[PDB]
Design a protein around this ligand. Structure first.
Ligand SMILES: NC(=O)N1CCC(CC(=O)N2CCC([C@H]3c4ncc(Br)cc4CCc4cc(Cl)cc(Br)c43)CC2)CC1
Ligand SMILES: [Ca+2]
Ligand SMILES: [Ca+2]
Ligand SMILES: [Ca+2]
Lengths: 453, 453, 453
């Protein structure tokens, strides 16, 4: 609805605002079941041969599931165990009587909340029943007609009912029993919508999940669990969006280098704090790898596992990078290569050396030839940006962008004492190394004065 | 046809030449459409039950698509927005009358160039027509026979026509409306070949794309766009290979360490400029992550978004790393671990410490025991290389390789003043830090002479 | 069976023991074949139209396969060429007579060991025969009935036989002839089990592969090779687990920072040697990217291509990080951000600044409020850990964990002379930089004493 962008010429960075949060903060685990016929040996025509081949497909899938059952700042992030919750629920299902308990609860209803032996109550869902189809609809037909089908529709009906089980088996077979995104075979759209509708979450959360079922699938896992007592069970671990509708901003950064003609005489700094930022419980959830988040219109879906919890003062780096409340993260170097960062509403261009950097229009061609340094163009009137031999299309989302003029902060650094190979550096750390270099010169020149006598 | 390789003993690096370029420089967006029946409520036998279940599959896919519609040096690279072009074309399709315009243009032909309201002319393709099948071939059969199919072939024919739509829906459902590579369901081989044949590109480009359809699919996107007025539309964003048949070379690098017996006394340097290099418009497109490129015989498919535009003088680093025209990139360390880099025509082996490094033959077993340091073997007579507990198979592509002897450049560095923890360093930067260290010793010893009196 | 874990308070790291190895050390390449009918023009009813459409699907797949045929410490790892072995075997299949040799060997048996012209003997497997089905079962039916099918079962039987070829074609079409994991369409479970059963490996290796078919698929490749003389051939490159049942341990590391109240006054160190470690041939195979390995109960599947061969003395870093036999790897910084590392049997928590860090229970909620610094909790009584706005579920695998108390080693470092921006650093390298800083102060103060007169 209302996306805005600000470019900071002094720090070669841009911020996009107007986004609303949808953050995965927890997990909800449901048990999905399929009823299976316990068939072993058949007592058997072209139509019967097709049924027996379909029965072999069914038997091999059951067998295969049984064997399957037993047998910049991303470096600062912690390490999670993504499916620890669903795997814990699955371990409980192996305990004596747990499967029979679910089989009894789902006897006449397709959905039921079941309390496991550990006190946890889970939503259980039966999505397919091949036990009643094979045992009470297919096998009695083969007996009353003494190995004759007659109706070809019987073959097609079994093929259609069996197909889902074969696809689920195929998926778990190539993914070692763990799949993500959760496919339509694991949970159809109506089953997922039905699951969200019964989840112990708010109406705003149900509305969000129901309107973004495709993002929910991407942020979910399906874990192959157990196959016993005529039951195939798998755990679908669904996201819990505990943080919704809080403001988010995306910070885009690009190298800021001096533009002196003398080769090997330039210095660079880059803001390393690029990423997604969302307000959350009085702090800011920072997602360094913005590519991990997913954007649907003005909504940003991020996962807290890919976040750092920072004080809201981190935003002051977008107001004044030399502020005293928060030590802004930067990296230093002497690598003045040319590149561009395509933002939400425009393009940051870092043009150095002899590189040809331009911004173009589909009707008029080149409309701007960038000069050396870090500049920006909005997507209004611009369709593409070219930096050397690389052409970038800009995003065409409607918004308002503001160019905040200012002298490149790299100009206020003495190149003689610049710490030019810092990566996990900050404004204060760079200043502390500069102070050490200046103090070592101060003490040397103090001795050269004292030695003059 | 004509691949050659040179190993540089002095810099522990190798270059493979003889490759021809195929670089993705731009994008071409086409609109792919499927005609849909606007069915809602049916007026209905084993065969009719199968048709009604197939109609539910059709209705749920349409519904699901409607909900889907609204809701070393890689760190130097810029950031693009890969589908900004296709998404821009899609936004235009939402404007009033755009869909009807395409529906009219494709009324009697399966392909038509349509001019959108923004002046852009796009290739439009209708790949499937379920509107005529369901409304004029399936529904009238159910009315004239008063809910009777009789012909089982009717069920199978509908199942075959519907299958493509269900697969496209399944794909967009697990990929949030954006897929890559573009599958055969999105665009069949003949549809892709037909699209390439009508693209506004040269005959050499059509021949290249047509002979590498499998690479074109990998470098393409399918973007779910709009579903309205009996039309399902999706944008297929295809690569534009603006740079073809220019020479390419792959640079392979490996750590070069001193081989002194005293533990903790060794120093290392590694060329960090490894990657793919292609001639392009008077400059060199450098692809640091060579794994992003795809090689088909002597043709290398790279994407300019994954490139740096460098002066052609970067190649001088393969002639003389101490050249004055280009400042060659290196990293320094004191981590003399053993490893191997499998090249196009051989293997670079960095053997340090007590590690067992060998090169073997399938008929004779071990044929070479590497000594400490950085050495190389060609794939002629060699099938595998082993460095410690790691066995590597070498590529068996036919070619000619040359061993360029020379003293390891790490031997000419004073270990006492070696800057041993530089990553984004170069030959000049390492020399500048060495000069500072030597000058600090010079001034200290000048004071020790002046203090002697 | 017997997983144990030790947390080291002094180094903010934990080790998990009790795992057994299954390491991919080599490759075994088999040739998989499909017999094809050489059909071109058909001499032809609703059932016959369905057969002719199925024949077009068959013809286009054959055509598409013919066009396909011609046209922290991970940075220390070497570079392999994963499919060099399978691609070498495939190149041999293109030589004159090689395909006919396999066609003759598989004439009456579905499996046969064939000796290629280069001396290599390979297991060959024919998984499907569409040549006999189309030429001797489908085409003669169309001739004797003068373009009449009569039996709808004929259409369904052809559709079922053809489906596998279309799926294999679809897979190679979207993966440029190279797929991984190897799907059930490339090799069914019984074909893979049959292949393992005939591989030239031990009974323990066959038992391991057969019990972990899903891991074998993940560590295998299918390479589209040649289509000629009524034969479709593809190479399935299978893992060789040359190292099995040797002990493995997983090392989990997290930042260890001082906890002083003064902002910007803290220093950090982190053990960078996190990863999987397996005993192997008298050395230790180290897998820095533990995420590359796969764990099935107490078995860890790793690939030697993702390993460093280290002396077994690397384990001494878990006994005493200041030991004289092995120089332990660490990184330094002044970035005291809060994070958690979920281990096999618990959670390491690095809590700094004003961050709220807790460990919770499903029955009692919060059961521990972490203090500043690096602490640990076991999974006994703990279900989740929260560090700021990030909630982590802990693994619930049964095991015994031990807390080894000790003063944080970061406390024994003088913050004034701490080298705080080292990444590829070690205990000795950090000590050497500290010595240089202390010696520069020593010589300055020696001159200030000599200048007093
Ligand atoms: N230098 C640090 O203190 N880092 C914190 C931990 C982080 C984790 C990591 O493995 N990496 C590797 C890549 C990065 C890192 C890097 N990468 C590879 C190698 Br060999 C050495 C270096 C060391 C510092 C450097 C400096 C610059 Cl100019 C750019 C980068 Br991209 C890097 C960060 C992530 C690496 C960077
Ligand atoms: Ca682009
Ligand atoms: Ca190999
Ligand atoms: Ca979790």
């Amino acid at each position: 609805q209302n996306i805005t962008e600000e470019f900071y010429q002094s720090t070669c960075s841009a911020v996009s605002k107007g986004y609303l949060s949808a953050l995965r903060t927890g997990w909800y685990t449901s048990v999905i079941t399929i009823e299976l016929s316990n068939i072993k040996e058949n007592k058997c025509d072209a139509k019967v041969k097709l049924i027996k081949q379909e029965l072999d497909k069914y038997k091999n899938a059951v067998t295969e599931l049984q064997l399957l059952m037993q047998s910049f700042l991303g470096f600062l992030l912690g390490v999670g165990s993504a499916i620890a919750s669903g795997v814990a629920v699955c371990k409980v299902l192996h305990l004596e009587g747990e499967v029979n308990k679910i089989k009894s609860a789902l006897l006449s209803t397709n959905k039921a909340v079941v309390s496991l032996s550990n006190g946890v109550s889970v939503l259980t869902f039966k999505v397919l029943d091949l036990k009643n189809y094979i045992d009470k609809q297919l096998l009695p037909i083969l007996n009353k007609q003494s190995c004759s089908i007659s109706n070809i529709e019987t073959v097609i009906e079994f093929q259609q009912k069996n197909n889902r089980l074969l696809e689920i088996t195929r998926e778990f077979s190539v993914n070692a029993g763990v799949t993500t995104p959760v496919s339509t075979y694991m949970l159809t759209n109506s089953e997922l919508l039905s699951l969200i509708n019964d989840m112990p979450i708010t109406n705003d959360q149900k509305k969000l999940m129901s309107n973004n079922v495709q993002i929910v699938r991407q942020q979910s896992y399906s874990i192959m669990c157990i196959i016993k007592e005529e039951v195939l069970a798998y755990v679908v671990q669904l996201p819990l969006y505990g943080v919704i509708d809080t403001p988010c901003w995306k910070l885009h950064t690009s190298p800021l280098c001096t533009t002196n003609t003398k080769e090997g005489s330039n210095i660079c700094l880059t803001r390393t704090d690029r990423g997604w930022y969302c307000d959350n419980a009085g702090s800011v959830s920072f997602f360094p790898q913005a590519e991990t988040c997913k954007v649907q219109s003005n909504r940003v879906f991020c996962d807290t596992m890919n976040s750092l919890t920072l004080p809201s003062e981190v935003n002051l780096c977008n107001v004044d990078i030399f502020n005293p409340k928060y030590d802004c993260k930067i990296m230093t170097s002497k690598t003045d290569v040319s590149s561009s960062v395509i933002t939400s509403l425009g393009a940051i261009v870092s043009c150095y050396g002899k590189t040809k950097c331009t911004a173009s229009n589909k009707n008029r061609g080149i409309i701007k030839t960038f000069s050396n340094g870090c500049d920006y163009v909005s997507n209004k009137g611009v369709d593409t940006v070219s930096v050397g031999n690389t052409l970038y299309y800009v995003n065409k989302q409607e918004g308002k962008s503001l160019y905040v003029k200012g002298e490149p902060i790299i100009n206020f650094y003495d190149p003689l004492v610049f710490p030019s190979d810092e990566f996990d550096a900050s404004i204060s750390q760079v200043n502390e190394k500069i102070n050490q270099s200046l103090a070592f010169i101060r003490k040397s020149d103090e001795l050269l004065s004292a030695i003059g006598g």
